[PDB]
Amino acid sequence: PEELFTKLEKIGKGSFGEVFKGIDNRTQKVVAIKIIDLEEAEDEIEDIQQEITVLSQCDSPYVTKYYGSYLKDTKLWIIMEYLGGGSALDLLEPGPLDETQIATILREILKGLDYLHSEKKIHRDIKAANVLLSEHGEVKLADFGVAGQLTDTFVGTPFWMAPEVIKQSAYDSKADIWSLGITAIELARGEPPHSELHPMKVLFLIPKNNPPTLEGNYSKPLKEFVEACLNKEPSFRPTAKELLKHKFILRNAKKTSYLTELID
Amino acid sequence: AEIVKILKDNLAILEKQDKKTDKASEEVSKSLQAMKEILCPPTEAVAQLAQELYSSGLLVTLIADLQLIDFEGKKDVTQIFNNILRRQIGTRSPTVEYISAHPHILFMLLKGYEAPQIALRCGIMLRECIRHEPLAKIILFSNQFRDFFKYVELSTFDIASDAFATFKDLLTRHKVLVADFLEQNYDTIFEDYEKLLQSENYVTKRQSLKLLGELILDRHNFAIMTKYISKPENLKLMMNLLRDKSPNIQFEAFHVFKVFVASPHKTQPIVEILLKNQPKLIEFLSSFQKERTDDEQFADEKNYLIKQIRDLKKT
């Protein structure tokens, strides 16, 4: 169980277990080891298994690769793609991001969303914390959502959630477009809208109040990109392919190798 | 209809272990890619495509020779199968009727778990079939259903987890069908289930114990519930599992155990075990998982069982 892999440095202490930088003793390839203690993580096994099902069905350089799972006593070892470039949320920590960087990151999320939506899949948790970087500058999507609003909750971060998801009405790929619009504000302002409020208050606000708008010293194409995504009506929101041809993305997005400048 | 003729002949060429089949695989995948574009929107040419797949018997050979098809082609086979299966002409569902007349399709999918290269793909399609009561009835009442108890205990976690996913669905979806089935094959089906509660695998032991609790508490499974809680060796197992090294396993056992105690029509061998361990179980449940503070139901549930055991008397 532990004979096929060797755990190097502890790259992160997870919610249920711990994540380590690893190397396959067979193929010599570098991987990420996600060791989950299935104890203390009462239930949630069905949710991990459901995420494994989705990840095993995904084959794209814009969605984190899954290699397999191993069970040792009460601990579950998950072998996935190693991405030592942190997250888009970590890039916001040293300081503010320029519109070139915001457009480059958003383009890569859209490329990932285009694959998932074409494969009839919804990410359900699009945010800077779930947008990961390689080390070379590659941007990949990780940590998908679930299913059933009662099962979501009070526990939950609804800042990125679409109003139809909270309204408990039928939602499709277009819900991730709302989440993208909130992530665009998150990448521009540092934090998502209504961040100053309690999650429960934000949960009720989103379906009631008007959609958020990007305020401050930000260009018209960026403001219009946010406005397009943040529409209370999901059928009025553009597709992932449609937003790839947006005036903001085509003019401000550059090479992904330029994102290597931000590694803290 | 045009594409069907090419795919039928090319698959027979691919059936042969000859090296000349390398060119036929390109033609097979291209045929499946064309069919996917018709079904998955235009529905005029879809009507004729279905009858062509039924009459040819291609829907049988495609699962039979699924391991010889490439990754891209295999994906299309799944998309085609799952779309055709949901087709409905009036009240009738033509594919469910077809697989009812051709049951080998269902067993080929189930035998799929044995081959890791197609196990998960088969699992998805097999699960889609068992959504409909007649197709679930065929697998449930078959001798091949017993293979799940071996398929859920497989070395690869992902396949084993997918095997339990289908197994769980088969025993919880069609509640009227399952209740009648379990009543008929009780002695043989629970002899196999006991091995899952005895499993060395934590996940197999936890999920089986949880599903058992879920099954017994359902209104449809009253006859099965009464039969399970009447057997003395079953209570002994639940009482032994309450002492397991895993607090999650002993909590999952408590929900099966509570059913044995709370029943008014308890059999004499059961009453004897509960009376023989009467003060033992009083002090156990009084200190059992006191760490679970944010659970008022569990606190009330323990006190009820403590009272029920204290109120116990001889006949």
B48 vs B2, B3, B20, B101, CA distance in Å?
A: 11, 12, 32, 20
What is the CA B161 to chain-centroid distance, rounded? 10
Spatial distance between the Cα atoms of B67 and B112, rounded to a whole number of angstroms: 9
Q: Which helix (H) or strand (E) holds A34?
A: strand A30-37
Q: Which helix (H) or strand (E) holds A133?
A: strand A131-133
Residue B9, phi then psi, degrees to nearest 5: -70, -45
What is the CA B221 to chain-centroid distance, rounded? 17
Q: Give contacts of B 176-205 with A, CB under 8 A.
A: 201-203
Which two tokens mark A145? 């959502």
- Same topology, domains A1-82 and A83-264? Answer is no
Q: What is the DSSP letter of A98?
A: P
Q: Give burial (CB, 10 Å; 0-12/13-18/19+) of A253.
A: buried
> Within 13 Å of residue B264, how many CA atoms lie on the same side as its CB?
0
Whether A71 and B165 lie within 8 Å, measured CB to CB: no
Spatial distance between the Cα atoms of A110 and B211, rounded to a whole number of angstroms: 40
| Pairs of CB atoms within 8 A across A/B | 35
Residue A212, phi then psi, degrees to nearest 5: -65, 160
Q: Is A70 on the interface with B (CB under 8 A)?
A: yes
Residues forming a β-bridge with A75 = A37, A72
Q: Is A14 on the interface with B (CB under 8 A)?
A: no
At A153, which amino acid appears?
T
Whether A39 and B158 lie within 8 Å, measured CB to CB: no
Spatial distance between the Cα atoms of A133 and B191, rounded to a whole number of angstroms: 51
Whether B158 and A42 lie within 8 Å, measured CB to CB: no
Using a CB-CB distance cutoff of 8 angstroms, which residues of chain B are in contact with residue A49? Answer: 161, 165
Q: Which residue has the tokens 């290269």?
A: B117
Cα pseudo-dihedral B262, B267, B268, B270, rounded to 10: -60
Would you say A152 is a known binding-site residue?
Answer: no
Known catalytic residues of A?
125
Spatial distance between the Cα atoms of B201 and A50, rounded to a whole number of angstroms: 19
Among A76, A93, A6, smallest CA distance to A36 is for: A76
Candidates A38, A52, A53; nearest CB to B202: A38
Angle subtended by helix axes B24-39 and B46-56, to nearest 10? 140
Q: Which helix (H) or strand (E) holds A215?
A: none
Give the torsion sign (CA, B225, B228, B230, B236): negative
**Backbone conformation region of residue A142, classed left if phi is above 0, alpha if psi is from -120 to 50, else beta:** beta
Spatial distance between the Cα atoms of B136 and B309, rounded to a whole number of angstroms: 41
Whether B203 and A68 lie within 8 Å, measured CB to CB: no
At A141, which amino acid appears?
L
Spatial distance between the Cα atoms of B309 and A68, rounded to a whole number of angstroms: 47
Instruction: Assign A36 to helix, strand or coil.
Output: strand
Spatial distance between the Cα atoms of B127 and B165, rounded to a whole number of angstroms: 8
Would you say A109 is a known binding-site residue?
Answer: no
Contacts of B118 (CB under 8 A, 6+ apart): B66, B67, B74, B112
Would you say A42 is a known binding-site residue?
Answer: no
Q: Are B82 and B76 in contact (CB under 8 A)?
A: no
Q: Are A121 and A54 in contact (CB under 8 A)?
A: yes
Which two tokens mark A222? 């960026």
Using a CB-CB distance cutoff of 8 angstroms, which residues of chain B are in contact with residue A76? Answer: 157, 203
- Please state, as a whole number, how many other Cβ atoms lie within 10 Å of the Cβ of residue B23: 11
Among A33, A29, A26, smallest CA distance to A4 is for: A26
Among A70, A107, A94, A84, smallest CA distance to A183 is for: A107
Give the torsion sign (CA, A165, A171, A175, A176): positive
Q: Are A236 and A82 in contact (CB under 8 A)?
A: no
Which two tokens mark A249? 């993305």
Angle subtended by helix axes B46-56 and B2-15, to nearest 10? 30
Q: Which of A34, A44, A72, A74 has the most B C-beta neighbours within 10 Å, making it the best mutation to test the interface with B?
A: A74
Using a CB-CB distance cutoff of 8 angstroms, which residues of chain A are in contact with residue B157? Answer: 68-71, 76
Instruction: Assign B270 to helix, strand or coil.
Output: helix
Among A163, A168, A161, A144, smallest CA distance to A234 is for: A163
Among A66, A173, A167, smallest CA distance to A116 is for: A173
Say which CATH superfamily domain A1-82 falls into: Phosphorylase Kinase; domain 1 (3.30.200.20)
Q: How is chain A split into domains, by residue range?
A: 1-82, 83-264
Spatial distance between the Cα atoms of B92 and B98, rounded to a whole number of angstroms: 11
Would you say A34 is a known binding-site residue?
Answer: yes
Residues forming a β-bridge with A140 = A132
> Within 13 Å of residue A164, how many CA atoms lie on the same side as its CB?
20
At B195, which amino acid appears?
K
Residue B235, phi then psi, degrees to nearest 5: -70, -45
Would you say A13 is a known binding-site residue?
Answer: yes
Among A18, A53, A72, A46, smallest CA distance to B202 is for: A72
Q: Is A39 on the interface with B (CB under 8 A)?
A: yes
Spatial distance between the Cα atoms of A179 and A183, rounded to a whole number of angstroms: 6
Would you say A227 is a known binding-site residue?
Answer: no
Whether A42 and B246 lie within 8 Å, measured CB to CB: no
Q: Which residue has the tokens 């990125």?
A: A160
Spatial distance between the Cα atoms of B182 and A164, rounded to a whole number of angstroms: 41
**Min Cα–Cα distance to chain B from A31, Å:** 18
CA A59-A65-A66 angle, to 5 degrees, is: 105
Candidates B161, B202, B206; nearest CB to A49: B161
Using a CB-CB distance cutoff of 8 angstroms, which residues of chain B are in contact with residue A74? Answer: 202, 246
Contacts of A40 (CB under 8 A, 6+ apart): A16
Q: Which parts of chain B fold into alpha helices (H)?
A: 2-15, 24-39, 46-56, 58-64, 71-85, 94-101, 104-110, 119-129, 133-140, 148-151, 157-172, 175-184, 186-197, 202-217, 222-228, 232-241, 247-262, 268-276, 278-287, 296-310
Residue environment code for B162-172, b if the CB has 16+ CB neighbours within 10 A, otherwise e: bbbbbbbebbe
Contacts of B14 (CB under 8 A, 6+ apart): B21, B24, B25, B28, B65, B68, B69
How many residues are there in chain A? 264
Q: Which of A4, A44, A58, A71 has the most B C-beta neighbours within 10 Å, making it the best mutation to test the interface with B?
A: A71
How many residues are there in chain B? 315
CATH for the A83-264 domain, from 3.30.450.80, 3.10.105.10, 1.10.510.10, 3.40.225.10: 1.10.510.10
Q: Is A118 on the interface with B (CB under 8 A)?
A: no
Which two tokens mark B115? 């081959």
Among B146, B203, B200, smallest CA distance to B170 is for: B146
Spatial distance between the Cα atoms of B111 and A84, rounded to a whole number of angstroms: 41
Which two tokens mark A220? 């018209």
Q: Is A60 on the interface with B (CB under 8 A)?
A: no
Using a CB-CB distance cutoff of 8 angstroms, which residues of chain B are in contact with residue A47? Answer: none
B63 vs B3, B99, B116, B160, B222, CA distance in Å?
A: 18, 12, 15, 21, 38
What is the CA B243 to chain-centroid distance, rounded? 28
Spatial distance between the Cα atoms of A129 and A183, rounded to a whole number of angstroms: 9
**Residue B271 is part of a domain; what is its CATH number?**
1.25.10.10
Which two tokens mark B57? 């018997």
Among A58, A55, A67, A88, smallest CA distance to A5 is for: A67
Q: Are A161 and A138 in contact (CB under 8 A)?
A: no
Among A70, A36, A52, A12, smallest CA distance to A143 is for: A52
Q: Give burial (CB, 10 Å; 0-12/13-18/19+) of B41.
A: exposed
Which two tokens mark A170? 């039928």
Which two tokens mark A229? 């995504």
Q: What residue of A is the nearest CA neighbor of B75?
A: A57
Q: What is the DSSP letter of B13?
A: H
Which two tokens mark A234? 């999901």
Whether A71 and B201 lie within 8 Å, measured CB to CB: yes
Spatial distance between the Cα atoms of B201 and A14, rounded to a whole number of angstroms: 24
Give the torsion sign (CA, B281, B286, B291, B296): positive
Secondary structure (DSSP) of A38-49:
SSSS-S-HHHHH
Candidates B158, B201, B246; nearest CB to A69: B158
Would you say A154 is a known binding-site residue?
Answer: no
Secondary structure (DSSP) of A146-209:
-S-HHHH-----GGG--HHHHTT----THHHHHHHHHHHHHHHHSS-TTTTS-HHHHHHHHHHS
Q: Which residue has the tokens 């797949």?
A: B53
Tally of structural domains, chain B: 1
Spatial distance between the Cα atoms of A33 and A10, rounded to a whole number of angstroms: 9
Which two tokens mark A150? 């009662």
Which two tokens mark B313? 């008397």
Which two tokens mark B84? 């055709």
Q: Which of B161, B164, B291, B292 has the most A C-beta neighbours within 10 Å, making it the best mutation to test the interface with A?
A: B161
Q: Are A23 and A4 in contact (CB under 8 A)?
A: no
What's this structure's resolution in Å? 2.9
Angle subtended by helix axes B247-262 and B296-310, to nearest 10? 50
Domain hosting B206: range is 1-312
Spatial distance between the Cα atoms of B274 and A11, rounded to a whole number of angstroms: 51
**Min Cα–Cα distance to chain A from B158, Å:** 7
